[PDB]
Amino acid sequence: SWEVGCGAPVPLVKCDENSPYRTITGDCNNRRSPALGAANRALARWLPAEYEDGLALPFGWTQRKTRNGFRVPLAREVSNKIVGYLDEEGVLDQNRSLLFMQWGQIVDHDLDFAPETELGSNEHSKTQCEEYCIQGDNCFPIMFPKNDPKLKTQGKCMPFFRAGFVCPTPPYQSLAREQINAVTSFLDASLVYGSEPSLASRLRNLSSPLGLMAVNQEAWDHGLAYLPFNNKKPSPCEFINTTARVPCFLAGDFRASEQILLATAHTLLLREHNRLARELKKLNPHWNGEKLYQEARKILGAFIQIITFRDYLPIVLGSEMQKWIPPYQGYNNSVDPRISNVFTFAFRFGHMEVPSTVSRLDENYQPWGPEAELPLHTLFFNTWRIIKDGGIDPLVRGLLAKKSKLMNQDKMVTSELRNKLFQPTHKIHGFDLAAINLQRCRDHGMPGYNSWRGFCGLSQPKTLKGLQTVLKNKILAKKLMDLYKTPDNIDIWIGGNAEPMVERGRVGPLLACLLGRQFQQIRDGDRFWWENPGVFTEKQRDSLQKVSFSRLICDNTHITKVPLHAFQANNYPHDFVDCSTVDKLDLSPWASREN
């Protein structure tokens, strides 16, 4: 045989079989295979990787080398011809709040992160990849097609660095290249606590014995906590306004400041940890700092699991929810809890749910000041609009009262992401998330659309007429055939997102299958699943059943009017109630009696 386990990186398996709490790394969840679901290991392969050279080089790397007899089209040309639209009118989701989009990004960041390889440390190809657009090693530039307006204003290419891969990065490995998942595959609030012991300790307040997370000591939100600043340079949150000089936040996850509403959600979860820890200290004054942090951490993880599986997944998967995620039947230690490489592209359906603007709303849910509504691109790596523009509350009102973008076959990704994305160290609001997604599919050796259709037991269209029937769209099928030539070559991100949405859902059949299977595994394969008998007492579970995003807002802001169903499209004041009428989390079942 060949390498049965290339695990030279992170070989430390020191598991306490008795511990009632998760590790920060995800190790020790599975007793028989303790690294399963742990951070800093390979993404799972549900199907074999598909590279140009069978091992590592992406389809599209070598100009002459076809996929199935056809050249793969430029990611940016696919973005321009299929993904782009001008008219934002009529694009909003009449039955999903903006919080529906934002929760999807939060869950995705809990589950997976494939960071760009670190060969840019005091390196030219950091700026040389950008400067000279020369493909090589980890530089895999997104080249502009001839008619691209960006060819006129931005040079020959958008820089793009190949994702990190296991059995270290600069040299070869054991058959095909496997990209890393840098976070824990468990739905475990790793995005609040970190997936690495160093970060996890840095985020804690070890000054007091109260099991608190560290909070900003330079700025307060009407006496409510902010995340600490990340005091490291260069900072993209500083770069986007050098007058305000407000740094990025430091959170459990590297990406927390990518946009202002992610930073907002991260702020609510930090507040909630410190709140739970304070309540537990009252009930159990005998509890030390560690105990308080672990018990609060375990409650926040449960909160995230319930909102996700009870409130969010049903209104993503629609009719397909029951097919893929049956009612829970307990922990199955034969289930692979690892996030799959393909899932990390399937969950990018959220890119098509991001609308072009973000609003700040006042306490009457009316525009907050003269520039209440802002273009999303001005809010990438933007903490100063929080610190110096009325805190998170007006943004949280926006999350409740404003709508997600609806996916549309003729209006896929707003230009705010498709033409104006800002990437750290790159200096301009000029990148294309759609093109990045297609290039990344190829970077990760993704099987094409029809391989995934076959994996999901769905038809594999071979012709224009077959693709028209699957997509229920003749113009969309024609553009995809003109670019790809055969449906076998369609990159999974665009092919899954092109399918019309399932009844009561927000993704098509192929994505429902891939997402559904992944979520089934992360629940069934988790020893610490909130509803796994023994994790919580039956009384704790009866209290946990009452959590809501609504209560989270009431407890962790100066917002007093909230909807009951925060992911539905809700209009003020008709759909809003006082916080008074909203179920609280009763922590009394956490009262710990030895005497």
Ligand X SMILES: *[C@@H]1O[C@H](CO)[C@@H](O)[C@H](O)[C@H]1NC(C)=O
Ligand Y SMILES: *[C@@H]1O[C@H](CO)[C@@H](O[C@@H]2O[C@H](CO)[C@@H](O)[C@H](O)[C@H]2NC(C)=O)[C@H](O)[C@H]1NC(C)=O
- Residue 22 Cα distances to 35, 92, 160, 403, angstroms: 13, 39, 35, 36
CB 167, min distance to Ca ion, A: 23
Question: What distance in Å separates the CA atoms of residue 122 and residue 111, rounded to the nearest whole number?
Answer: 30
CB 444, min distance to Ca ion, A: 19
Q: Binding site annotation covers 286?
A: no
Q: Which of residues 211-250 bind ligand X (CB under 6 A)?
A: 212, 214-215, 217
* Alpha helices, DSSP H, located in 353-392: 384-387
Q: Which of Ca ion, Zn ion, ligand HEM, none lies near 184, with the C-beta cut-off 5 to 8 A by kind?
A: Ca ion
Question: What distance in Å separates the CA atoms of residue 37 and residue 77, rounded to the nearest whole number?
Answer: 36
- 558 contributes a contact to Zn ion by CB under 5 A: yes
Altogether, the residues listed in the chain come to a count of 595
Q: What is the 3-state secondary structure (H, E, C) of 159-199?
A: CCECECECCCCCCCCCCCCCEEECCCCCCCCHHHHCCCHHH
Rule CB under 6 A: choose which of 242, 334, 580, 595 binds ligand X: 334
Residue number with CB closer to Ca ion (192 or 492): 192
Residue number with CB closer to ligand Y (384 or 519): 384
* Residue 89 three-state SS: coil
Question: What distance in Å separates the CA atoms of residue 67 and residue 44, rounded to the nearest whole number?
Answer: 23
Question: What distance in Å separates the CA atoms of residue 270 and residue 111, rounded to the nearest whole number?
Answer: 18
User: Per-residue contact track with ligand HEM, 375 to 404, x per CB under 6 A?
Assistant: -x----------------------------
| Residue 484, burial from CB neighbour count under 10 angstroms (0-12, 13-18, 19+) | buried
Residue number with CB closer to Ca ion (102 or 486): 102
**Binding-site size, ligand HEM (CB under 6 A):** 20
44 neighbors 339 (Cβ within 8 angstroms): yes
Does residue 377 carry a catalytic annotation?
no
- 472 contributes a contact to ligand Y by CB under 6 A: no
Q: Binding site annotation covers 188?
A: yes
Q: Binding site annotation covers 455?
A: no
Chain-centroid distance, C-alpha 287: 34
Residue number with CB closer to Ca ion (110 or 393): 110
User: Closest Cα to residue 325, out of 514, 476, 475?
Assistant: 514
424 cis-preceded (ω within 30 degrees of 0): no
Residue nearest to Zn ion (CB): 222
Residue 290 corresponds to which tokens in the numbers above? 């560690």
Q: Binding site annotation covers 351?
A: yes
- 362 contributes a contact to Zn ion by CB under 5 A: no
- 243 contributes a contact to ligand Y by CB under 6 A: yes
Residue number with CB closer to Ca ion (467 or 522): 522
Q: Which of residues 332-361 bind ligand HEM (CB under 6 A)?
A: 344, 347-348, 350-351, 353-354
- 552 contributes a contact to ligand HEM by CB under 6 A: no
CB 212, min distance to ligand HEM, A: 29
Q: Which of Zn ion, Ca ion, ligand X, none lies near 222, with the C-beta cut-off 5 to 8 A by kind?
A: Zn ion
One-letter identity of residue 364 = N
Residue number with CB closer to ligand HEM (440 or 523): 440
Given CA atoms 12, 13, 19, 24 in this order, what sign does their dihedral have?
positive
What b-and-e string marks burial along 396-409, b requiring 16 or more CB atoms within 10 Å of the CB?
A: bbbbbbbbbbbbeb
Q: State in Å, rounded, how far the first CA of the chain is from the last one.
A: 59
Q: Binding site annotation covers 190?
A: yes
353 neighbors 101 (Cβ within 8 angstroms): yes
Strand partners, 361: 367
Q: Which of residues 150-189 bind ligand HEM (CB under 6 A)?
A: none
Rule CB under 6 A: choose which of 127, 128, 241, 532 binds ligand Y: 241
CB 522, min distance to ligand X, A: 13
Q: Which of residues 166-225 bind Zn ion (CB under 5 A)?
A: 222
Our CA angle for 190, 27, 17, nearest 5°, is 120
CB 279, min distance to Zn ion, A: 21
Residue 494 corresponds to which tokens in the numbers above? 């665009």
Residue number with CB closer to ligand Y (116 or 373): 373
User: Closest Cα to residue 296, out of 265, 263, 266, 272?
Assistant: 272
Q: Where are the beta strands (DSSP E) in 413-567?
A: 421-422, 429-431, 561-563
Residue number with CB closer to Ca ion (26 or 141): 26
User: Per-residue contact track with ligand HEM, 434 to 453, x per CB under 6 A?
Assistant: --x---x-------------
User: Closest Cα to residue 307, out of 560, 551, 572, 579?
Assistant: 551
82 neighbors 479 (Cβ within 8 angstroms): yes
One-letter identity of residue 411 = K
Question: What distance in Å separates the CA atoms of residue 538 and residue 524, rounded to the nearest whole number?
Answer: 19
Q: Which of residues 383-412 bind ligand Y (CB under 6 A)?
A: 384, 388
Q: Which of residues 65-104 bind ligand HEM (CB under 6 A)?
A: 101, 104
Q: Binding site annotation covers 459?
A: no
- 380 contributes a contact to ligand Y by CB under 6 A: no
Residue number with CB closer to Ca ion (192 or 582): 192
298 neighbors 275 (Cβ within 8 angstroms): no
Structure-token match 């995934």, residue found: 452
145 neighbors 133 (Cβ within 8 angstroms): no
User: Per-residue contact track with ligand X, 188 to 207, x per CB under 6 A?
Assistant: -----------------x-x
Residue 170 corresponds to which tokens in the numbers above? 């600069």
Q: Which of ligand HEM, ligand X, Zn ion, none lies near 527, with the C-beta cut-off 5 to 8 A by kind?
A: none
Binding site residue list: 108, 110, 184, 186, 188, 190, 258, 351
Binding site for ligand X (CB under 6 A): 205, 207-208, 210, 212, 214-215, 217, 332, 334-335
Report the interface residues with Zn ion, using CB under 5 A: 222, 558
Catalytic residue ranges: 109
Residues that bind ligand HEM (CB under 6 A): 101, 104-105, 108, 112-114, 258-259, 344, 347-348, 350-351, 353-354, 376, 433, 436, 440
Binding residue ranges for Ca(2+): 110, 184, 186, 188, 190
What are the residues binding ligand Y (CB under 6 A)?
Answer: 241, 243-244, 384, 388
